[PDB]
Amino acid sequence: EVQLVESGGGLVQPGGSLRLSCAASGFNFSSYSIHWVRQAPGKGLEWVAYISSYYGSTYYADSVKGRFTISADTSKNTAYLQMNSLRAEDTAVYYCARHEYGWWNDRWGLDYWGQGTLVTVSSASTKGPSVFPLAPSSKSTSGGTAALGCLVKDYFPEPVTVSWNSGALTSGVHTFPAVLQSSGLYSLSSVVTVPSSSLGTQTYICNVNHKPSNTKVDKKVEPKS
Amino acid sequence: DIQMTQSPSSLSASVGDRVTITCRASQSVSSAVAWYQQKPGKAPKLLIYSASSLYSGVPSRFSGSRSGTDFTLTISSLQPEDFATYYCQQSSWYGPFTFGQGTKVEIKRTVAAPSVFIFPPSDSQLKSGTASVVCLLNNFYPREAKVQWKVDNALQSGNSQESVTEQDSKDSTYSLSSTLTLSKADYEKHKVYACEVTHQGLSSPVTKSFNRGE
Amino acid sequence: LETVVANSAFIAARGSFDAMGEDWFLDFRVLGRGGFGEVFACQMKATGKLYACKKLNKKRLKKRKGYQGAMVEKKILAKVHSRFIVSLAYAFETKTDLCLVMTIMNGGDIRYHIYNVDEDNPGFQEPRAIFYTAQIVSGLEHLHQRNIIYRDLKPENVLLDDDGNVRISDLGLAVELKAGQTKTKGYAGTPGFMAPELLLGEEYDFSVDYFALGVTLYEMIAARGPFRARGEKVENKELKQRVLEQAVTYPDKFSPASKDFCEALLQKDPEKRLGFRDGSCDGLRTHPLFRDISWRQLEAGMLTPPFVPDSRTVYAKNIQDVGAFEEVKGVAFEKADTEFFQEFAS
Amino acid sequence: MNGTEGPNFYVPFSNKTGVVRSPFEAPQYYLAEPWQFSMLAAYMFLLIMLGFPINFLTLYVTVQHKKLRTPLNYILLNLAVADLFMVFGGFTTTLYTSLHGYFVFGPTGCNLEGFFATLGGEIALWSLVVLAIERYVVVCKPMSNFRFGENHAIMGVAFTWVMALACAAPPLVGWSRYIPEGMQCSCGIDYYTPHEETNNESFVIYMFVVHFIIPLIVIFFCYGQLVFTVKEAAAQQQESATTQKAEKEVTRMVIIMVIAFLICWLPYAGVAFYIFTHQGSDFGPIFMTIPAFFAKTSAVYNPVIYIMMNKQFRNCMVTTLCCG
Ligand SMILES: NC(=O)c1cn([C@@H]2O[C@H](CO)[C@@H](O)[C@H]2O)c2ncnc(N)c12
DSSP: OOOOOBOOOSOBOTTOOOOEEBOOOSSOTTSEEOOEEEEOTTSOEEEOBOOOSSSOOOOBOTTSTTTEEEEEOSSSOOEEEEEOOOOSSOOBEEEEOEEEOOSSSOOOOEEEOOOOOOBOBOOOOOBOOEEEEEOOOOSSSOSSEEEEEEEEEEEBSSOOEEEEGGGTBOTTEEEOOOEEOTTSOEEEEEEEEEEGGGBTTBOEEEEEEETTTTEEEEEEEOOOO | OOOEEEESSEEEEOTTOOEEEEEEESSOOOSOEEEEEEOTTSOOEEEEETTTEEOTTSOTTEEEEOOTTEEEEEESSOOTTOOEEEEEEEOOSSSOOEEOOOEEEEEOOOOBOOEEEEEOBOHHHHTTTEEEEEEEEEEEBSSOOEEEEEETTEEEOSSEEEEEOOOOTTTSOEEEEEEEEEEHHHHTTOOEEEEEEEOSSOSSOEEEEEESOO | OHHHHHHHHHHHHHHHHHOOOSSSEEEEEEEEEOSSSEEEEEEETTTOOEEEEEEEEHHHHHHHTOHHHHHHHHHHHHHOOOSSBOOEEEEEEOSSEEEEEEEOOTTOBHHHHHHHSOTTSOSOOHHHHHHHHHHHHHHHHHHHTTTEEOOOOOGGGEEEOSSSOEEEOOOTTOEEOOBTBSOBOOOOSOTTSSOHHHHTTOOBOTHHHHHHHHHHHHHHHHSSOTTSOTTOOOOHHHHHHHHHHOOOOOOTTSOHHHHHHHHHHSOSSGGGSSSOSSSOSSSGGGSGGGGGOOHHHHHTTOSOOSSOOOSSSOOSOOTTSSOOOOOOSSOOOOHHHHHHHHHHOO | OOSEEOSSOEESSOSOSSOOOOTTTSOOOSSSOHHHHHHHHHHHHHHHHHHHHHHHHHHHHHTTOGGGSSGGGHHHHHHHHHHHHHIIIIIHHHHHHHTTTSOOSHHHHHHHHHHHHHHHHHHHHHHHHHHHHHHHHHHHOSSOSOOOOHHHHHHHHHHHHHHHHHHHSGGGTTSSOEEEETTTTEEEEOOSSOOGGGTHHHHHHHHHIIIIIHHHHHHHHHHHHHHHHHHHHHHTOOSOHHHHHHHHHHHHHHHHHHHHHHHHHHHHHHHHHHHHHOSOOOOOTTGGGHHHHHHHTHHHHHHIIIIITSHHHHHHHHHHHTTO
């Protein structure tokens, strides 16, 4: 069923060991195969390796070979993937597949997938955001409507939330998806479009709240000379 | 394994259109194909199993047909919630499982040009030792666009990162940020920061630029 | 040529049918050459019903010294009958042969159907093989409950009736164990359908029939035995070595359930061989393979067979393409032989 | 009268050139030319060269396969033996004599050659009849609740011999006579004149009725029935491609089989009958060699038809040729 909840979350260092473990229940694992399917963030679905109860056939994908050691349990229906070599492509919101066994020799798709809990492979340390103003565009795109924003840079772990004027401004706000930088720290920009005529007559302050470090920074954004 | 090749790579169709996407497996897998709907930050939903048999609790606008090597998923009437990436899959009960490359179904609307804004790095940004110049392309359609960064007319490559917002609920436009990252030391040896935007909505490349001082 | 004409005349007779001695049965074409002499179709003039008549030629009996084998088949089949063991109707003799007249199975034999399903694609698909395996199991079980070791079982001795249900037949290479033994030596059976124990001349129990079941199931799907290649069968000596030494190979045509099941039966050692361990034959039935089979309905004959034989086109063997064995080179019968011949007739 | 009757010869070239004497002592060149004798000798050599291997193979192959040893092949073996009688009795003698251009074995030789040639051809004739009977009985089933066994086959074989002797033996005891036919290098039955004084007339009537008309009726009956049966059966069995192909094949074969019986004995019957109904019909000496050509060639074409064109024999021959 839908109850295939990862309980193997948390950061784990590259080359480390963490045993991803399916909280599988609502069915009996012996007519199904709990082979590990990984939805990598903003990227397509892939297969890791086969899992079987009685049958005991296990086969890897040709890209995770010997970097994981499959294991299984039918006393709780948990399927444990041992981690023992990791890269950075082993970051995914892991899900547990559930695949029907035939009714003659029938192959089906994967009936259910998990609710996931994020697993990350990273060497980066905790560090709140430095919040810099992205000053108004008024040296080009003059008059009418001007855009301004805040660059929220060098934070980790994700997420970071950005609001404007303590949540009083949220209209016309486009908060872009995070991009992984070379450092191993995420950065994004949040922008808001405002009247060019309101500039230097209204203060626009981005209120940045990074929950993992409990780091809150209110950074004023004003036209510069 | 058995390679799964999705076609078309992307398509753009309006609401209430009949959309058929095709998937070709390199080797025949018999009737043993599935189709998924993936919308970002959600669990994949199974649509079709056995190449053509609907999964329970899936709308009846989705259907699949065909066998051999050429498999199909058909959406009879497109909806504004059928903005998704659709993945085909081959299954085997004694072989590998392999997925497609995804077919991007885009919800179509009229062409729109981007309003182009360039934002200076502040002095505060310079203190960290980095200068980020951010270019915003606001409310344009289609999603595809090309941003070219030029500093002093020198092409910038391999030091800029692009991020595109997920489709706006405002009117079904896209916005795109292109962030050019330089050192402070490079920034202070430069002057002209130009963001050139080439897009379908535009009839010529539009350059927005500023000179250092902000 | 003439063989098609003879087949056509049989078909003509069948059509009429659908709608002792040699002076009591009108004789048609042979349907095979059994273990002992011919097995031809024939018809009672007194009721207009078709029967197969396994004739055991007096000549061929003397040559092979097949006197024991004849008596065994008679006494066992005469006493033992089920829904998966053919009825025996008459035991008389004629001028030149001893006769056992048994009920028709004008649907052909499983061996025939392996290649007849499609010449360029021999062997059945998974549902059809599974179905037949389940029916064979019920027939074997019926023998085992009566404490009979068959020591053989092969596709050509598994006959289809008109409906498309299969039955085992021919109990001439069997032995009925008494209470006081549970294992016995021998060398009974046809090579390749004989278990390791049989070949080594060792004592064996009921196990050997389950080995044969494994060989049968494998052969239905792959169109070859576990111990020989497609459309080839090696010499008895080499075949004996294959059975004893070789581990079974499998394609992925098999489902995991069928693969595992087949392995369990083709296991070498009676103790690890799935089947009757003198507990139940229903331990075998618990295997996941039979989740697609309803045993209660199977035993009651209420399940629809996967293939239904045509009632016009007969799938019995062509006459001149059946087996053969030499008749005597001048060799005149012993007193003993004559005494057996009179005794056989009832 | 198309020839000249004598005490023990019948030249089918009438005496009117004043050189026509006994062809047992006179070289014949006044009713044939030297080239015609060379062609005769060539032809007789051919019939031996083909006939002996074909018939030897028929006997040979049967010993090596179980299924051939069955009762229904006995008559076929008998046919092959019959043909061989014609080869060594008729053909070989005629080959020797032709190169002298006349018959050099004398009146006694003529009786010998005529006996073996007739015996051969008659066993062959009655074999074809018996074979047709067996096919009719087995397939059309006029009598039911009987099994065809070894004994019945043997009776069938014996019957052909008895009927053959019934024809070959009479000209030796003066009921008709053997006398030279054709180019005077083979001896046939006298029927060229139904002359009372030599008893030709009664013999010709006996032959025509019992040994041609009777066979002809039986052959037509049996094969007519067989084709009828097979068409009906095939109509009720159009659920197999094989049966339809077979039906066409069998019908074609039966036409060939009937024609082959006709060709062999019809010339003798035709000529004899015409001469019986009206006497004064003149024919040449070479004309009387024509019936002999047709009859003698059946030693080759009968086993080709009745052995080679059967599935069972074919398989067996291939196995034996590929080591056996
Ligand atoms: N003994 C029997 O009752 C029969 C054996 N055969 C054929 O005879 C062959 C040799 O046993 C088999 O493979 C079948 O083709 C049969 N064919 C049809 N009906 C039957 N009752 C039998």
